[PDB]
Structures are given as C-alpha cells and as structure tokens.
Design a binder for this molecule. Sequence first.
Ligand SMILES: Nc1nc2c(ncn2[C@@H]2O[C@H](COP(=O)(O)OP(=O)(O)OP(=O)(O)O)[C@@H](O)[C@H]2O)c(=O)[nH]1
Ligand SMILES: Nc1nc2c(ncn2[C@@H]2O[C@H](COP(=O)(O)OP(=O)(O)OP(=O)(O)O)[C@@H](O)[C@H]2O)c(=O)[nH]1
Ligand SMILES: Nc1nc2c(ncn2[C@@H]2O[C@H](COP(=O)(O)OP(=O)(O)O)[C@@H](O)[C@H]2O)c(=O)[nH]1
Ligand SMILES: [Mg+2]
Ligand SMILES: [Mg+2]
Lengths: 52, 430, 369, 439, 431
Amino acid sequence: PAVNDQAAHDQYVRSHGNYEAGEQKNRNYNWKVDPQQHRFGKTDKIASNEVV
Amino acid sequence: MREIVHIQGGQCGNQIGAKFWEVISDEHGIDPTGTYHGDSDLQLERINVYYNEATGGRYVPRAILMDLEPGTMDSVRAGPFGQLFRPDNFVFGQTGAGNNWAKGHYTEGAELIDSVLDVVRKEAEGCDCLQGFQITHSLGGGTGSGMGTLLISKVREEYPDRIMETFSVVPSPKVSDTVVEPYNATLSVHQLVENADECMVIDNEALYDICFRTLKLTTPTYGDLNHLVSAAMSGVTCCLRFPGQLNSDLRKLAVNLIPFPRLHFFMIGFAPLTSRGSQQYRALTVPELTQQMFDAKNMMCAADPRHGRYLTASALFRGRMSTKEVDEQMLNVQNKNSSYFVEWIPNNIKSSICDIPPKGLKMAVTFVGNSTAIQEMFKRVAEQFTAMFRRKAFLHWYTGEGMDEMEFTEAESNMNDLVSEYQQYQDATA
Amino acid sequence: DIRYIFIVEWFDTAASLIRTYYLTYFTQDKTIEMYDLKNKKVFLKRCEYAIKDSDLYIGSILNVYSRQLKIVDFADVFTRSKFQNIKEKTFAMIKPDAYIHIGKIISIIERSGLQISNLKMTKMSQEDAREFYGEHKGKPFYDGLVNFMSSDLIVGMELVGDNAIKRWRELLGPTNTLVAREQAPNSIRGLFGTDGTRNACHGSDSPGSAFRELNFFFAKTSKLKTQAFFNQCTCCVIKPHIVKQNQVGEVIDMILSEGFEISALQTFFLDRPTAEEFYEVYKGVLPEFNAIAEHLTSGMCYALEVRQENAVKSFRDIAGPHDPEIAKVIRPNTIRARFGIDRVKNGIHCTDLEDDGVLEVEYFFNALQ
Amino acid sequence: MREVISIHVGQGGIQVGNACWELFCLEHGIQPDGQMPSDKTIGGGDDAFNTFFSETGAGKHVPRAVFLDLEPTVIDEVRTGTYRQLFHPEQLISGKEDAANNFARGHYTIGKEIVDLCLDRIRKLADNCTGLQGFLVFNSVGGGTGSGLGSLLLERLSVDYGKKSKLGFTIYPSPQVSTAVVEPYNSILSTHSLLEHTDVAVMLDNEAIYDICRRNLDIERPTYTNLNRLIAQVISSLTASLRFDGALNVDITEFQTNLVPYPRIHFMLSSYAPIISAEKAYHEQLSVAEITNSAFEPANMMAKCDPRHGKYMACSMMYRGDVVPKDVNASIATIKTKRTIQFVDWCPTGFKVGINYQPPTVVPGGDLAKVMRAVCMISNSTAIAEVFSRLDHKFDLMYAKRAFVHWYVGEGMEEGEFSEAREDLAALEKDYEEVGIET
Amino acid sequence: MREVISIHVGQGGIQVGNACWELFCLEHGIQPDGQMPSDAFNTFFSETGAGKHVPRAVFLDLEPTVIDEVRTGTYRQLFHPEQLISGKEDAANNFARGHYTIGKEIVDLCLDRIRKLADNCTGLQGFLVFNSVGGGTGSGLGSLLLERLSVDYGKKSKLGFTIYPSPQVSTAVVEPYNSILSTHSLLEHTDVAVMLDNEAIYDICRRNLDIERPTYTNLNRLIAQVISSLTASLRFDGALNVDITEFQTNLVPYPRIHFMLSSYAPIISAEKAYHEQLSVAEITNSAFEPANMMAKCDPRHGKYMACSMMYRGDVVPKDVNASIATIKTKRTIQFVDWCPTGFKVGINYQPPTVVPGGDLAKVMRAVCMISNSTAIAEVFSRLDHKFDLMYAKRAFVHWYVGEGMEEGEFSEAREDLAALEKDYEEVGIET
Ligand SMILES: Nc1nc2c(ncn2[C@@H]2O[C@H](COP(=O)(O)OP(=O)(O)OP(=O)(O)O)[C@@H](O)[C@H]2O)c(=O)[nH]1
Ligand SMILES: Nc1nc2c(ncn2[C@@H]2O[C@H](COP(=O)(O)OP(=O)(O)OP(=O)(O)O)[C@@H](O)[C@H]2O)c(=O)[nH]1
Ligand SMILES: Nc1nc2c(ncn2[C@@H]2O[C@H](COP(=O)(O)OP(=O)(O)O)[C@@H](O)[C@H]2O)c(=O)[nH]1
Ligand SMILES: [Mg+2]
Ligand SMILES: [Mg+2]
C-alpha cells in the first residue's frame, strides 16, 4: 500500500490543506470549556414572571 | 345572586383564562384544592359572584372550555390552580381548525357545538339567576373567530334578556400573527356587532408598548401580558362583589356607556403602575391615580385617544378614599380638556367606589371609555382587506367549504358602515 | 439534560383515596415538574419553585403549593446510581451529662455540611434500657453503663449528609475521652468530656449498625414517649427561616443560658389544615394573619417548651415586642433583635398570656401525635 | 393524539429519510436497539414523543415509516446496519429489477406489480393512528425509479384518502451541477404529476447545499453524508412544535392555509440558520436580531436562486429556542422597513410568528454544534420562477430532434405525453408572471 | 451605549492596527487569550455571553503573509475566526490593480462584514480607518472602501490615519503616483485625516528615547498611544467629555480643508525621565516645539487656525487656562486673523498605561494634539512638484494603464491637486 499515515496525515493538513471527505478545520485552540458540552452561546438575563 | 358563567374558545381565549381564574382566586384566598384560607369575613361574602358549591366543601369554578384542537386544552390543566376545573365540563375536538374561519364556523365547529351548547345550558339554568356572560376569545384566529362567534350567536337567541361581554384581542397592524388576520377579523365583527351586547378592543401591540415604557423590564414573557388583563377583567366586575359607597352591577355600567344602539365598543386602561425600583419614590395621592388613568400612554389599545373625542367616560375607583376627592378630580379634568370631550352630553364621566382594594396596593383605577379613537383600528383593518379581495388571494380555502363570494362582500358592507357612522357624530354639533 | 426521578405520593383529604406521582427534578436550572401514575396525563407543566438540593433524600418531605407530598423510594435505576454513594443516614444522641450545653453542641453540626433532619428528646426506661444495647450484654461494664442511662433527659437527632457516618465519627475524636484533649482539642469531646464513661456523646459506627439505631428511635412504633409536663409552662416555636439560615443552634443555646429548665422538644412537620387553626385565634389582630400561618408551613420547624416561674410573663419580658424592627431600637438584649429581620419571620414565637398557654403546649405533644 | 405517517420512495430520498430518523431518534431519548435506555426505562412518563412513535403494548417504539426502493442494494444495506432491529421486518418492500432512470419503466411497466403492497402498508399504519394530520413524502425528482413510483403514490393516495394534506420534500435538478444525463426529461414529466396533487412542494436543490456547507461549517470535502443531516435538521424545525410544549404552536393543518396564495402555486424554497461549526461558534452571541437578518441573506438560501430577482408572496418561519416574544417582534419590525427586500403588492402582512421551548439536540461527533437559538424558514417568493424556467429551457433542446425519446417510447409511454407535459410547465411559468404584476 | 468600529487595510495599516490592539488589550484588563482573570470597556469590545470577548475589527488585504503571521502567533484566539478576509494574490504597488482589476472581486465580502457589525451595535458613532498611501494595494482597496462606505451609510462620521511618504527618505519608487491618486479620493470622503509621516517619527524616538536603532516594532507603538490618547475620553470618567462626533465642528474651517498634523509629548525613557518635575507649563511648552511634530512640517512657516489639545493624566483644570495664556502671549506663534480663540480644551483622569517591554515610561501627565496647520501645504507643495517631473516623460505610465484605468484619470488628479493648494494660500491672507 505505501499509504500515508495519521502521523503524516496531519502534516498534509498544514502544508496544502488536503483533507479527507467530511472532516473539519482543526485550529487547536485552548478550550477552557468542553466543546462537546456547553451550548456555545450567550444568555440574556431572564427572570420569572416579573409582573408578580 | 347576580352570578355569571365563564366560556372561552380558541387557545387565545383559553390562555387568558389561566390567569384570570388564578388572578381572581387570590382575592378571596381560596387555596388550589378548594379549602378556604382567607382572613376577613368580607373575603367570603360574595363567593357566589364566580363560584358554586359541591359536596365535600371544596369549591369549583364555572368555566366552559370550548375549542377544536387538543394542543391548547391539554396544557392549561397542568398549570397552578388547574385542578379546580371540573373534568366533566371539558370538551374538545380531534381534528383542528387550521386557522380557516369558514372551517371553524360551518364545517367542523358547527358539529361539535351540540356538546358545548349542552354544557352551557345546565349552568345557566342551574344557578339562582343568570346575570350575563363573559367570554375571552381571539378575533385573529381561525378556530376562535369562527367557532367562537358561533357560540354567541346561538346563545343570544335563547336568552333575550341577558347581557354579555367579550374581551377580544384585535390584531395590531404592525405585527401580524396569522397571515389570514384580515379575513378572520373583518368577518368576525359582522356577527359580533348584531348580537354582542358589548365588546372592547385590546391590542397585543399595546401590551408590549406598556411593559417596556412603564414597568422598566428587560424581557417580558407571554405570561407578563396575560397577567395584566386578568387583573383588568376583574375591574369591571370588581364592585359587584364587595360593599361600597355606590355599588354598580355589570348592567349599570351598560346604561352609561352606549348612547346609541350600534356604537357599543370600548377600550380599557389600568393604573396605577410603578416599576420595581420606582415602586417607592412615587407618592400615592388620589390626584396621582387620575393623571395616568387618563394618560394617553396608559390606554391598553393601539388607537391613539387624542385623535378623537370621548363619547362617554367611565371610571371604577378601587379601594377606600374620600368621596369628594374622587369627584373634584373628575370634573376638573373634564373641563381642563373641554375640547376633547364631545359637547352635547353634559356630565360625561361616571364614578364608582368599592371599599375592598385589590391585594398588594392601596388605591387603583380601571379605565373604560367609548371614544372616537377606536375609529382608526377599523380603518387599518379596512384598508388591508380591500387590498387582498381585489386579487382574490388566499380565497380558495374559504370558498371550498360552501362559502360564497357575496357573503364576504356583505360582511365588508356592514364593516364600513359602522366606521362611517361612528365618525358621523364626531363633527356633530348642538 | 441530566435527570433524576423520585416517584411521590400525596395524601389528599377529600376521601380515603391516595395517589402517586413522579416529581421529576431538572438539576439544570432548578425547574420542577410532576406526572401522575393514573390515567397517564400531564399534571405539572414544568414550572419554577423553591426546592433545595439537600432537601431531596429518601425519608424527607417538602411542600409545594399547599400540598404535602413526600418521597417513597427510587423511581428509575438511573437515579439510584448517582445517590447510592452519597446521602447515607446516621443517628446521633447526647448523654444527659451534657444537658446544660445542649444548644451549643447542636451549633457545630450545621456548619460541617450535614443536615439536621429529625430531632427528639425523651426519658429512657429501664426495661428497654437493656434492649438499647443488645450486643454489649455480656461485658463487665454493661450493667453499670445501663444504670447510668436512666438518669436525665436525652436529646435525639438523625444525621444526614454526604458520607455522614464517617464524617460524624471523625468529629467526635478518639474513643477514650482523656486522650482526645491531648491530640484533638477541636472536637466535641475535647471541650466537654469529663470521665471515661461520661463521653459527651455516642454515635453510630457501621451502616449495618446505623440502620437499627435509627428505627429504634424514630419508628412509628417505639417504646419511648414524650415527657412533656403540662403544668406551669409556656410554648414557643422557632420559625422556619432560622433552619434555612442555619442558626437554630444559636436560638436554642440562647435560652439555655438564662437558666430555663428546657423540658420537652420534638420536631413537627405540618401542613395547612394544622397551621391556620393554631393561629386562627389571631384572626382579629396582626393583619398579617395569613402570611404568618402560611410561612409556618414551609420547611422544618422546632417546637419548644419552657418553664421557670411565670411561664409567659417572665419569659415574655425577654420575648419583647412583637415587631422585631422596633425591638432593636428599644430592646437590644432581647432574643429576636439578634435574629429577627422582618415582621413575618420574627424568629422565636411566644404565647400571649400565662392562663392561656397551657392548652397551646398541650396541642403539639398530646393530640397532634 | 396527533400522528404523522412517513413515506420514503427512491434512493436519494431513502438516504435523506435515513438521516432524519437519526436526528429524531436522538432528540427524544430512544437508544439504537429499540428498547428504551435501561437507566431511564420509565423516566419519560409524559407521552410527548407520540408524534413519531407508536407503542407496541409491551416494548420498543416502532418507527412510523415505510421504506421503498426497487433496487435491493441500498435497502439491503439498511437491513444489515445497527438499526436493523428498529423497523418492522415486513414493511420494507423491495423489488427485483431497477428502473434504470427509465421513467416510463417506473410508472407503466414494473411498478404495477409493487404498487398494491405499498398501498396495503399505508392502510394498516393509519388504522392504529386516530388523528392523521397529513402525509410527508420524500422522493428524488432526479431519478427515474423514484419519479415513476413517486408520482403514482400521490395520485393513488389522493383518491384512496381524499382531503388529507400532502407535502413533498423533493430535490430538483441543480442549475449547473448535474448527476445523470437525462435529468431534464424525468424532471419535467414528474412536475406534472406533483402539480395537481400536492398542496405544498419544497425546494432543496443540492447545488446550493454544497455552497452552504463550505461558507460556514468550514468543510472542504463534503459528501452525501453531510447533505443528508441538514435536511434531517430542517425537518425537525417544522415538526418541533407538534411534539413539544409551546407558547405559540402551529399545526401542520395550520401550515397549509398560510403558504399557498392560489390553487396552483404550491412550491417554496427553505433556509436554515444558524449553522456554525463548534470550532468558531462561541465567538458570537447569536442574537435574535442577527439570526433573522442572516435568515433572508441570499447566500444562506438552501435553494439556488436569487430572491432579489422577484417579489415575496408569503413566508412562514417558526423559531426554536429561548427567544423573547418581543425580540421576535424586534426582528420582524426591522425587516419590513428594509428596502432591498420587497413583498408582493397585495399582501401587506406576510409573517406567521412561531415560537417553541425545545432547542435542537446535536448529533454527537457531527459538524454541527449545539446552539440555543435556531429558526427555520420556508417562503413562497416569485424567485422560484428561475428553476422552472431553467428546467424548461433545457427541455426544448433535446426534443428538437427527439434525442433519447426512443427508450421511453419503449415502455408503453404514449408519445404525446411530452406534448401535454410541455404545456403545463409553460402554463405554470406564465402563472408566476401574472401573479406578480401590480394592480 | 456608544460603539466604534475599526477598519484596517494594508500591511502598514495591518501592522499599525496590531500595535494599537496590544495597548488596548493590556489597558482594560483582558489577557491575550481573551478570557478574564477575576461598563467602560464596551466602547471597543463586545460580550458573547460567557467567557471571552470579540474585538470589533475587520482586516482586509491581498497578501496573506502579514495576516498569516497573526493567525499563527500569540494573538490567534482573539480576532474573529472569519473576519480576517484574506485573498490570494498581491497587487504589487500598481495602484490601478487595487481598484479595477483585483479589488472589485473582494470588496464585496468587506461590505457584508461591516453590514453585520453595524446591526449588533446600537450607538454607531463613527469609523476610524487606517490605510497607507505609500503602497499600491493599501491604496486601491482603501479608496473603494471609503467610497462605498459613505454612500451605503450616509451621515456617519469617518476618520483616517493615513501615512504619506517622507520628504527625502523613501520606501518605494512609484510613491509619487499612488500618493496623488489617494488624496483625490480621500478628499471628498474622509472628514478628518491626520498626517503622520515617518521622517518625524525617527526624529521623535532618537531625540528623546535615545534609541539609536529604532525598528518598525517601535514605530507602530507611538501611534498605538495616540489612538489611546484620542479615544480615552470615551471610556473613562471625566470632568469634560469631548466625543468623536465633536471634532468636525472644532477643527475644520471650510468644507474643503480637512487635514491636520499630529504631534505628541512628552516622550522620555525611564532611565532619564525621573530627574525633572514635568510641570504643565513646560509640557504645553514642549507641545508646540518645532522639533516634536509627529508629521514633517515646520509650524513656523504658516498660520494656525485651530488646535484642540486633550490633556490626560492627573492635571488639575486650573493649570489649563493659565497655560493657554502663556501660548497666546509669545509673539513667535501667530494665529490666523479671523479666528480669535483657537483652542478646544479636553481633560481626562485615567493615567496612560505602559506596556511591558516598551520604550515609553509611565508619565503622570501628557498632551496629545490634533490641529489643522497652514503649513500642511508643504507636503502637497513638495509632492505636487515630484509628480510633475516624473510624469514629464511618462515614466512607469505604461503599466498603470495596464489594469484598465484610462489616461484621462491621471490628468484630472493634477488639476485637483492644484485646487487644494490654491485654497490654502487664500485662507492665509489676512482681511
Ligand atoms: N439530497 C441528496 N440527493 C441525492 C443523493 N444522492 C443522489 N441524489 C440525487 O438523486 C438523483 C438520482 O436519484 P436517487 O434518489 O439518488 O437514486 P434512485 O432513487 O435509485 O433513482 P435512480 O438512480 O434512477 O435509480 C441524483 O440526480 C441526485 O441529484 C444524496 O445523497 N443526497
Ligand atoms: N510607520 C510604518 N509604516 C510602514 C511600516 N511597514 C510598512 N509601512 C508603510 O508601507 C509602505 C509600503 O507598503 P507596504 O508596507 O508594502 O504595504 P502596502 O502599502 O499595502 O503595499 P503592498 O506592498 O502592496 O502591501 C511604506 O511606504 C511605509 O510607509 C511600518 O512598520 N511602520
Ligand atoms: N398576549 C398573548 N396573546 C396570545 C397568547 N397566545 C395567543 N395569543 C394571541 O392569539 C393569536 C393567535 O391565536 P391562534 O393561534 O389562532 O389560536 P387558535 O386558533 O386557537 O390556535 C395571536 O395573535 C396572539 O396575539 C399569549 O400567551 N399572550
Ligand atoms: Mg437508483
Ligand atoms: Mg503588499
């Protein structure tokens, strides 16, 4: 096969942006929160029925 | 004596009820499970105004929940105080209205009325003496304006000597909630005007206008707008249940509000209203209530009152207060705006006093008045309707259930006639 | 998101029927929702309320909307998985030798992170005294110890909290009382203990042993009865907010120092039918009648009995004016002025007259039981 | 008490219909092997999920779907995967010979031996349900095999049942991308069958979908797998209200009477947003105002067309999330005042506001990331004329010298059928122009 | 409730943009990663609901090298993931190239990006745009950007901190052309433009900072402070607030002349700064010193029409007016005849921040001046002559015509440059 390997798969990512079908641009930031959880959004303050 | 029943149709009518009954319930201190827990004997004196009795000592509200779809009905039950309703009186359909007015008045709704017309009959005769009917429904929805209006028309023929009230939330022009808003509203008034003893317009647009400029809140919810109305609805019927200087039943409000046979539409405004942080700085004096209660921004309708003249004015002062101060404030305001009050009806303000104030405050006022300002709300609806009909847009659904083009034309004729006649007296002089 | 379900049952009053629900709990945003087992219809539409994370444990109760409902057992397997390790149950008691310090010892328990769930005080009996220690019968000191157990009042309480049993044990210190002070002076035993057999308190060691001692002293059918003396006495009830604010030890400790002989006290969880009627007398005064009777229903509440010479007058002279907001200005040393914060939560409550008090104290401990 | 019967016909429709069941199954809380999760066996006391599942009396919840395809390869793939244990064994009816993109073959020659079983399957599913609301049918107009079967079912269903609502999630031919070499033919004839039988037709052209994925999701090599989910996510948006508590619910019987101005016009193009990859998502608050503004942006239109080229008749968009009703009122007010987007003259108001309390749930490991606020739109604007005109023009060239018409003549398909079909598309095209002219 | 958007274009503009962000980031209390280690800061940033913040900026350019440095350094987390629009090819100082051949296909994404940001904000005050005329790409793209900006929005104010070429020190060889075409476009679109030529800057650091080897890293730093000095009033409590909108009505005498020259003081190294008191009298004295003009012009060579100077530091107001009296009395600084009072005093409280590893030393007081000067005609005078000489024999002309531009466009620039010179002479004549 003489196939490329994940050890070389990432390198090709950095060189010419050559990927495999259906995979995403990984920038490897520093997530203080877990990407899978946490709804990645902003919440505007909303209390109970204030007219009470 | 002089008791009333409660009937609601469509989710707009039903949703409103969820607050009124919870709004009204607190006043007498009835706990959710029907066990009395109030302080004063006055709290129990007129439990006959809206309630009844049953074995076991637990009370129950007399309501009629009528609609064609299960989404709205299955929800209100689970809410707080939702266990008070008798499951026997529940009635519901299985198909759904789909917002087609013709669908909810002749094709589907007409079939299910017999069951609903049955429930209404027992309560009316089952009481000591029936005073009238109060109903909450939406003029902007297919199931409401179609099936809702059917209930009133049949009822009126049966009980010629009773009065009725309808608190309809007419759809404002800027924000529309149903692409069929024009048709289902224009047709609705046709039947309503003939037999509806009374009808007062409340604008959802006003609901949003009042909150963001007076209460000083950040994000209202559907309950927020709902809460006020349920408090408001008690205002007209507040003085029928508690002792006071000048008691005034629902009819008495009728006598001094409708000068002529057809002009029978009203608008309301609630005060006082102070914000969370502004709840203490404002000083409470009887003159304080008057300014806002006639204040333009306090009117609960989109129509601007300053663009017309008041045919008649009514006011229900709430709580204990010096009798004269109630009047002296009223007359002065009557002269200080002599131009805005039509000149051919002297002494065009009524007053009332109820000694038991709503819990949480010390003095409050509910505004009701028939004014030439309500002219605009029809014209805005009139302009929209004429646009669509010329191109027969959105018409196939309505005509496919037996309706014929002429009936639509006839409804408009009455609609415009009411608007034209209303401005007839605006320029009238003595 | 993440859900825990506790099937619940409510004891209505219209008829003998009883019903069960699910009483779901959204830990994501503290929302409440309930569902009924009969007719399979939605009951509570997932609204907001006031339920605290520590008030949800097997064998506890919490009110919602003037309805008394309590947990029964685990609903789904998912729930019994998370709470299997946390939320044990271990019982505690205080020997009569520490009677004149009872309020203080209670003080540190709350601060530690546990919860005071149940509490009772009674006078042990010789016949059951031997039954109290079923395993130590043969030991040489077993007889002598039993002889001492029948001296004077005993204060009982159940400790519930995350890993409570071990946390309780490390709070006492070493077995012998003498050795504790040399090594552990920050424990109950390092401050109050006197001799080897007069250990400040005795606790539960093993979960297998922890179960029995809890039933024996808090079962529906127990041999120990209240010892409330109904002559020359006045009654007072600690309002719930003190338990929620974690100062109950302070309130109790305050009245012990005055020399009062504290006679009887047993917890009481109560609902509307037994709340309004007790305060029903004030119908014509205290225009806050509904609230004070209302708030009395929410959360645990202690019941107290006090007697020195003149039950009401002598105690009322330190009970002070009913309005706490004005108590501070004219009564700094009185009880409430240190805790009262507003009109409807004014801490300790005192009856009105000496001649009327007796029946009040008889209500809790004679009929309500 | 509301149920809906799901029908899938045609390979491309099969895969798309495949994904949606993963999105729907994940949303409610049902495990892959049919039996509820052991952890929360009876946790879900409320019967909210009835909208798509029917109790077996004792056990799992059987999907309310019927999968059809005249070629065993793709379906046999379905009946060997991890979901093999979910669908009813004897409802996935498979044939013997493929239609080979021969529409005449898929409607007059082979289909007559399998239509009956499909109808029988349709009937038995309904009897269990009590309140049938309507029919959702997926099918790919680009394939002959789907087209012939797809046309037949609607006509058969329209007569067997009657007035029940009918909807179709088709995928028409891309303006410039193509898959087969005879797509112009099979598309035009198919439109004839679906024109006079369906109340609503949706636009999901695949050419735009590829464009949509690249610009936001940041994926340079998209395959059919990514395309399928988006539609599956789109489906949940319209059907979210029927199965969750809602401050303002909208019924499928309520959708029909607010989107079709006239008896003939029953098409519209949809769009969805926001769709932000988890890598670059949390940098924006995702306000109610900005999401709506991007909603009408030409780029995010799921269908390859330019709405600026025409007018708007009526758009019904349902939100989902924690939107504040005033904020919803906040968004619309701005849109109308805008000048770049203009409505048709005879419709002063064209918004149907919808809100919900159930936000989307993210399929694990996918491109999409979780977000509180989401909105789906489907508008019927005069822009759709471009696709119909573009398809029609392509038809004229081939028919100039009867190229490729000999095979369709080989399956009992009358020659004049093309003559009659051509007129209807031309008739439809003239319909759009007449409606848009000002009064 | 007031916000301002930042627009940057060109390598110098991009690099000059980077410099201002380090000062702003370290000024308000945000680490480079974007998180906050536990309402004024809204003036430049926004909140995404949880955690970090997203600066309100947009970067445009045609060459990826400079920008690609950003997305690989320590400031990678901050800027918007997609707002750093990047092209594929370089214009290569062919001013035409950046306006009719390559700029047309990329400006579109720019207009959309600005469209989004304006929606989120509520109090759009104005646009501050940096662009260098000394380079082709930075010129052509900038010109179209400003042209589309005005027509799309309307009356919203704009600011441009351009960078023209030095009198004698030069960077490119075609600077005379791209410089001329820049002024014509910016003349009718940018309300306020500050000259910041380099040749003064090198004289600024060496004369004071005693840095004999200044590098572009340090040069960008000075403009970073000045942006801090001018914007400081918008994001801190003050006894006298002067808003960005309150500049066009205190610095522009006529609709045409809308150019001012910048200058800064004091600048002193921490090794030598702490042996003098730094009194207000001298600090204002050093402000008008001909040495210190941030731009290469001679103040002694012309009139003054208006000079708005913003103190910032702990200066007590009382010293303010007295200093003004000192300036007005010296006979060596003569104001224009028709303007009696030529000052608009502004004061702030927050002391200037010092970035670690910098050259400037923390001072308790400072002055930043932005005033129109009649001398500014010197650069136009010198530049106009240069264009005439090289255009005599159509040097380099055969290329610019190679990107679609017409020959007639160049000629009209010459006439316009003549008009600007004529007006300046007219304004100087006493009545
Ligand atoms: N949305 C979507 N469309 C697809 C996909 N694959 C194929 N198509 C479309 O489907 C058309 C062909 O019909 P398919 O449904 O794919 O296959 P089929 O149903 O078996 O029809 P035949 O190929 O004629 O047998 C092609 O022109 C494509 O445009 C897919 O994965 N997703
Ligand atoms: N003050 C200052 N100016 C710079 C710096 N770097 C570049 N410049 C200016 O940029 C001009 C040359 O153009 P470039 O820096 O190459 O960028 P450009 O103007 O957009 O033209 P391009 O080369 O096409 O990118 C010079 O005349 C300088 O005035 C810097 O670090 N500091
Ligand atoms: N203020 C307020 N109005 C409501 C609420 N729910 C519904 N409405 C009104 O009801 C109208 C639409 O009702 P509709 O959906 O047709 O009711 P249905 O026909 O019974 O389904 C809208 O114009 C709303 O203004 C609510 O919670 N609050
Ligand atoms: Mg196929
Ligand atoms: Mg370059």
